[PDB]
């Protein structure tokens, strides 16, 4: 039935979660992170604003492929961190391990720039996303992740509602970034929980999948809704259900 | 009826500016007396704005929209959080209580208000800023800061008025700004040595500001002419010196 | 004869020099400055580039009277330094001295903003200029000032020649800032010389006046020339003549 | 005749890049081997440029005109000054001598040249940058930096070439840049352990770069296709490994 079509996004959710755990492991074999303070989400957010400000001044300052380059470089590096973490727990400190990861990341990034197969895109998007998920999740603990999640969710629903209301007014009364990015969002709580086969934080994983269910449901219905609050609110739901478990 | 309204707005900000002073010094800390403090202050504002605008000229759609929302949220954190949870207080479920409070408010402010809501919130924030600086030091750097600021206003008004005799948001910002300016002599003189019906010379300043704004609103309806700050700013100054020459 | 007309600019030269000396005095009674290194001119120049970059991003970001304000504030402060230095050597550390200078500078700056008498402008321009002259001149020593002067002069002649040649090509083959600023330029060597009634650095003062003579001469002739090299080259000429003296 | 000219330009830059190495380490100092050095390097370039352009978008008339003139003057100071006065040397009238030298040159470069003048100067500067980095560390971070940089080029060429198969200043800059790229394996392998006709494997790299650029110029006249860096960059790399497998 409606299996093969549009299961790929919950697929991507589960996968990213999986790869985030498996990456929880090697990334501490060389540290990484960035104190389970509730101020940590605030630093996160402001810094996110800086990430965008930089990115925008870069785009408006392009840079026909200078923009492509600066991001290409950013990519190259983040993949170095991915791979790096892999071999460095794997073959460990060996020259053949490190060089293994540099060649790996060169290969991958070059590929992505060479008009790949663009199922490939989904795959790398999954990699990257899992990477980030693992990092902040390894970085500090739930209650802070929980605050962060609920905050970001609130911003979102404000954002959709504003522009939706702005649709309903104006008569008479690159998407992948936001996407895969939100693929990441509920998963970071999944890491920073197994960081605090798996726990009762499978619960967070399933609840996040169920949030995604409500989401692709309303999206496959007429007259869309917000996003984060289904995914985060559902991951938090599952997670808190996995407390009522043990 | 709003003819009482805008003085009310002031009176309230002043009251709420004082109430926050106690819990405000549960940390507080911005800027000794030192009159270089007003200068550092000015340059801080000018550089702040210059940066803030280049954020617009480099922004500022969903960016500076959100960016302001964030700054707003933080400032509301300090207001709710620090000023009420320490006023409980302090910690634990109270602190969480105010996170809930400030997210509730900034989210509410965003989206669409209803008259009084925005007035209330502006008043609150204003009281916050007022309290902080009035605390962050004494009534003499404040006296100078005030006369400086006011004199700038009257002059830019005349220049740009005289710059006429030829031939939305920044408004609420500047409004709030005027709600703030006299309140600092009120907090910072409360940081001074008398105490009648709770600090007499600070009362003097307070009424002096309420009458200053009155005179301004009269001339505002007289037509065009109003040197912005110099009524209430300079007049609350007059009132303060009046309530101080008493004790 | 041609006295009263266009002697006012050499007038302004002598005056600024005079006021720069008289200010050499009080400004050390509270220090100021900024090492007689030849790297000092380079720091100067780069920093000058920063002064302009700031000023330009400010103008292009105006600021109808925000621009007016930011500069008004800058002015207010530099006059505080002028006056401040005055009373603080004068009445010294007294409250009445300091408050004297704040009221003084408020008065002056407010005046300048109130459409003054605009001979007044020349006068304040003279004040300011002398102020700056005194500061860098008190700051470090001749050979560095000498390098700085010759450098700046070279930039200038390049600049005029470029745009002049650009005039001669395009057929078929606020001024006060640059002005009073150059009023300042040769005088800083006049300070940093009496800092290293006056010396044989009267020589630098007269030679600078004579440079100005060549300058207002060619300017009052058809087909203009560069500027700095007459003024600086002439001040340096007089100065080096005041070495062949003692 | 310039058919020999552009290889000459390279050959010279390489020579002049080496000559400067000795006096260059009379201070020098930019960036241990460490391959993070190439990464730090890239990010340095990207952030450098991004800033440099926002200087244009915020400039850049008489500003960035002069600003470049200044940067140029400084870099010429280090070339003349440090590389010749310490090579005298060092100090006193020699140092002054080079101030005179570099002001003379940058002023000369500004205003209008004449063919060879700009070529000469570009070559000089290039040798400077080449020398510094080749010194600022060893032939392995350099190997990686090189293959990274080159691979980026071939890919942006194909993308923007393939971005075609639908339907002035930066040129000299990028040119100079290519004059630079292979010379760093030449300096930095001279910073390595053989010494025939003065460092044999560094010779190998050097000829390998001279033939690489040759192959590039052949295809450039073959029509359109030239993956910028990968000929000489990747080829000088081949040559270096060839002259190294010798001793």
TrEMBL record, chains B, D:
One of its GO terms (molecular function) is identical protein binding. One of its GO terms (cellular component) is endomembrane system. This is Signal peptide peptidase. The chain crosses the membrane at residues 1-22, 39-56, 63-87, 93-112, 124-151, 195-220, 232-247. InterPro entries: Preselin/SPP (IPR006639), SPP (IPR010545). It is found in: Endomembrane system. It is a multi-pass membrane protein. Its main location: membrane. Keywords: Membrane, Transmembrane, Transmembrane helix. It comes from the Archaea.
